[PDB]
């Protein structure tokens, strides 16, 4: 089973303001469970998942104290990067972080993640080996040189292999009835006529969880770039939507639906009634 | 649980 814990951090500088906005978003199996925001009346790690209510005040206070330190780490790092790129003191700047791990089979650790970003583009990232760094530019090479002498990678590896794995095991046990929940998609084909004697057959897929789905059109065998596709969109009730369409002459064509919620892949055609 | 970063950039 593919299981993963992620922490999506953001630090946005404000014009003239001494303190920037720090947001830390936690994810378990691509779905949100925890969130911290500096803009709030009382900045604390708030539960976003219903199964997360099981934790006592000891867990919430410890995570909030971790976030307060991170809030200042991002504040200094953001100011140090202004010195590297030799940019103006007043402006809008963004520092992003992606950290966590993938379990694999079965509850053992498969891949470690630790990436950083500046102005939307890549900056510095910890490699697959979890010992070396990849610098996107010369400013990131200074950060790399700083982290190589201090041995930062050694302690980041200790989290991803230790604490990150240990805590994800607990979240899978506490939240199991709603986390391992699978929703099968609702599939149907629509008819849309066009000029020049052509028609667009749109293969729909509505109400499915998780977001991972595969929609392909077939002319008996395999239709690649000629097929129109849209990004997987959320409905709003914790479920997803997606469709795939193809331009065909004025016709019986096959659509293939691949989802983990359904036992056998769905094969469907158009009517008419 | 979240992670606390080491040395700054």
């Amino acid at each position: 089973g593919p299981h993963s814990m992620r922490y999506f951090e953001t630090a946005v500088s404000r014009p003239g303001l001494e303190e920037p906005r720090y947001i830390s978003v936690g994810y378990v199996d691509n779905k949100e469970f925890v969130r911290f925001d500096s803009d709030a009346e009382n900045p604390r790690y708030e539960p976003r998942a219903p199964w997360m209510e099981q934790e006592g005040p000891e867990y919430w206070e410890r995570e909030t104290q971790k976030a307060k330190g991170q809030e200042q780490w991002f504040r200094v790092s953001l100011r140090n990067l202004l010195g590297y790129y030799n940019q103006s003191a007043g402006g809008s700047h963004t520092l992003q972080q992606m950290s966590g791990c993938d379990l694999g089979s079965d509850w053992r650790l498969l891949r470690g993640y630790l990436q950083f970003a500046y102005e939307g583009r890549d900056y510095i990232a910890l490699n697959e080996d979890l010992k070396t760094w990849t610098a996107a530019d010369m400013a990131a090479q200074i950060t790399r040189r700083k982290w190589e002498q201090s041995g930062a990678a050694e302690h980041y590896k200790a989290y991803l292999e230790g604490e990150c794995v240990e805590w994800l095991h607990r979240y899978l046990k506490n939240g199991n009835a709603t986390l391992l929940r699978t929703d099968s998609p609702k599939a149907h084909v629509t008819h849309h006529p066009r000029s020049k004697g052509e028609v667009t057959l749109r293969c729909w897929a509505l109400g499915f969880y998780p977001a991972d789905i595969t929609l392909t059109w077939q002319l008996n065998g395999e239709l690649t770039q000629d097929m129109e596709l849209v990004e997987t969109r959320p409905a709003g009730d914790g479920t997803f939507q997606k469709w795939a369409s193809v331009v065909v002459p004025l016709q019986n064509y096959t659509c293939r639906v691949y989802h983990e919620g359904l036992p056998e892949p769905l094969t469907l055609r158009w009517e008419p009634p | 649980a979240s992670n606390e970063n080491m040395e700054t950039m």
Partner: T-cell receptor, first 111, second 113 residues
């Protein structure tokens, strides 16, 4: 208020040096400054609780250790003639608050 | 530059007189301006500080006259005592980073009794 012992430190070239600084004020931030004779005290590095920050032009020359929030240390390895200066240690309750300086440790490196 | 530059290098004045210690800064974004005093064999202690909002800060004898339109500071010591004989430093810190105080070379004051 901000302790710094010894007041004078002596070391040979190539040998490592570790200058210790302590505070009883329970401050989150502790700084390290370099004071050259008849020159402005320049900031080397600082420690906010657990987080360490080093200046882009300072790093590779200076290292830092923190056993607990009440203490702070500046590490030099290896020592050279260019390291011979007065080393001041500052302490602040917050990252954006007033700084309280120690007496300073005068370092002299000889061949 | 930043820089921070201070004038003069060393000032000598008789007891009871008024001593003027000048300072100049380059960065206009500087808001906080603290003044430190250190005695021989003793570290710098916070004497008196001034912000960009105000242009005058009084504390008995020690006074700072801040000028934003000329980017300069001045420390006035009325009725100079021999106990004031110390090195006077001036620092400056901007908004985004208050931790980084850009200090001056200093002025070595000598009060003749």
């Amino acid at each position: 208020t901000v302790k710094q012992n010894p007041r004078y430190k002596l070391a040979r070239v190539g040998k490592p040096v570790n200058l210790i600084c302590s505070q009883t004020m329970n401050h989150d931030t502790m700084y390290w400054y370099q004071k050259k004779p008849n020159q402005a005290p320049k900031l080397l590095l600082f420690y906010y609780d657990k987080i360490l920050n080093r200046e882009a032009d300072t790093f590779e020359k200076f290292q830092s250790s923190r056993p607990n929030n009440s203490f702070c240390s500046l590490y030099i390895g290896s020592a050279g003639l260019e390291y011979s200066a007065m080393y001041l240690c500052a302490s602040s309750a917050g990252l954006d608050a007033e700084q309280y300086f120690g007496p300073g440790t005068r370092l002299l490196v000889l061949e | 530059q930043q820089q921070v530059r201070q004038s003069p290098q060393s000032l000598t004045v008789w007891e009871g007189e008024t001593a003027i210690l000048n300072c100049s800064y380059e960065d206009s974004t500087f808001n906080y301006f603290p003044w430190y005093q250190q005695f021989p064999g003793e570290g710098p202690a916070l004497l008196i500080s001034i912000r960009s909002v105000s242009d005058k800060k009084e504390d008995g004898r020690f006074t700072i006259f801040f000028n934003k339109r000329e980017k300069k500071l001045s420390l006035h010591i009325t009725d100079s005592q021999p106990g004031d004989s110390a090195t006077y430093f001036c620092a400056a810190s901007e908004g985004s980073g208050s931790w980084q105080l850009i200090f001056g070379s200093g002025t070595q004051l000598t009060v003749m009794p």
